[PDB]
Amino acid sequence: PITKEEKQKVIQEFARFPGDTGSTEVQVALLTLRINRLSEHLKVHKKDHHSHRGLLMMVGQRRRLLRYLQREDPERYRALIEKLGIRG
Amino acid sequence: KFKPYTPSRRFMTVADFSEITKTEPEKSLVKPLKKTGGRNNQGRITVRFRGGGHKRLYRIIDFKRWDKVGIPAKVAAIEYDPNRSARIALLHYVDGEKRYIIAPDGLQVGQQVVAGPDAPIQVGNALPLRFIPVGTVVHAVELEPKKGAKLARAAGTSAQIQGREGDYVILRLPSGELRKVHGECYATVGAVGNADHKNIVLGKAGRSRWLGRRPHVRGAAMNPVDHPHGGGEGRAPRGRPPASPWGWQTKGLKTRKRRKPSSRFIIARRKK
Amino acid sequence: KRQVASGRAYIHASYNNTIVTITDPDGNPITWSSGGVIGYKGSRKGTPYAAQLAALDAAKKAMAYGMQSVDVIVRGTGAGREQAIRALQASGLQVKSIVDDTPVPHNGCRPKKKFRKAS
């Protein structure tokens, strides 16, 4: 489940600069990761509509933030796109 | 090696409502098996309607375990035969030889199970009643020891263990009744393998039924020259009679039949 | 007769008929009485009155066997379970200890309209 450690490690791989204790980068890393192992679970289950739901809202959130990502700058952004994989 | 029930062809003209089933072992049976004559005609006089055939394999299956009462066996795997209401497992006995046996609740290829003098009450092994953990399930079960697996609850998921008394344990049998068998006798552990089958749907009758092998039945079939009942007209007769000089369909058959009182009670009925 | 000085006295009661019975020390019984045992019918049999009476009987018989000492078993409640139990201590014939059961449910089977009106 939620492995804090490795977590921070990637918050790291991403946060271009070691001083990103909360940045678009991370909103990204995080919502992503979560979204994914979470969802995978969703699959082998089929009925937890409540949490499915939340997950929903969440994914929204993340994507939208990215929205802004583009808004100001999608450049570095597309790089992100890249690094990650999502939206292809 | 289980099997799909539901697959149904679709609108391939009136071939409508045709239910498929597919055991996955799909292998063609093995070494131990002859074939049956073309009975329907028999003792050379001829008898009982329907009857027709359609292709030809024909079985030999194990009905008796006390004959190795122990050599673990591992599911050779699944498969079946042009007979039986609920597939089989060709099983492998650790000693080399194998045997076509039941096919209780969805067990598992390679699974080890066996039976005899104390078998683990795990659906799959079999045991002398007595090892009956009262409240459990089996089938195949046989009263009068040695008289082989007597009461082969076909796809008959039905041997419900219901208490004991004397040298006989009580059982709830398909039918909706409770008989008794002296404990030393035996039961295949667990339950059957098929039922949905029982629900299977088949297309253009002629086609299906016949394929089944069976042709027909046609009552008070006009010209009641015989056909017990009336005919030579529309109207359904009255008397209240059936084919070959019959008693309708609401009368006994049993008797002293020392058989009867001897065990079982519940008397013959259900109520779904 | 079996005779065993002490046993149990079961007092169980409805609210239009009640019942009592003599049981050995372990659990079987020998004799009893009740609402309609008391030359009674319909209601009435549900009177602390009858209660008293059948109690009575349970008693005379009670002595009638090698017993009289007893623990009281409580089952449900009777419309006059008291006049009943009091008739009990009354004939004495021994008025020992008392057990509490009237074995509660725990929620597992909706009743009949009667106590369904009890949402």
Binding site: - | - | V74, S97, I98, V99, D100, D101, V104
Partner: protein
């Protein structure tokens, strides 16, 4: 609230984090092994809650009647 018995002061420093507390636990049993209430443990929401939970754990595996033939009545 009614006061002539009470129990919050029967035992001091008690770890609710248990089950094998035959004794202390017992200290809320009353007769038909009920669960002697706020009405007696005078133990905050936090309390009736967790304390309860273990009460539970306790009947659970066992060793405590979670009700019982009452002798007296």
């Amino acid at each position: 609230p009614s006061r002539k018995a009470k129990v919050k002061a029967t035992l001091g420093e008690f770890d609710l984090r248990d089950y094998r507390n035959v004794e202390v636990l017992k200290r809320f049993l009353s007769e038909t092994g009920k669960i002697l209430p706020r009405r007696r443990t005078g133990l905050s929401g936090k309390e009736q809650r967790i304390l309860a939970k273990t009460i539970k754990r306790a009947r659970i595996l066992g060793l405590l009647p979670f009700t019982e033939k009452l002798v007296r009545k």
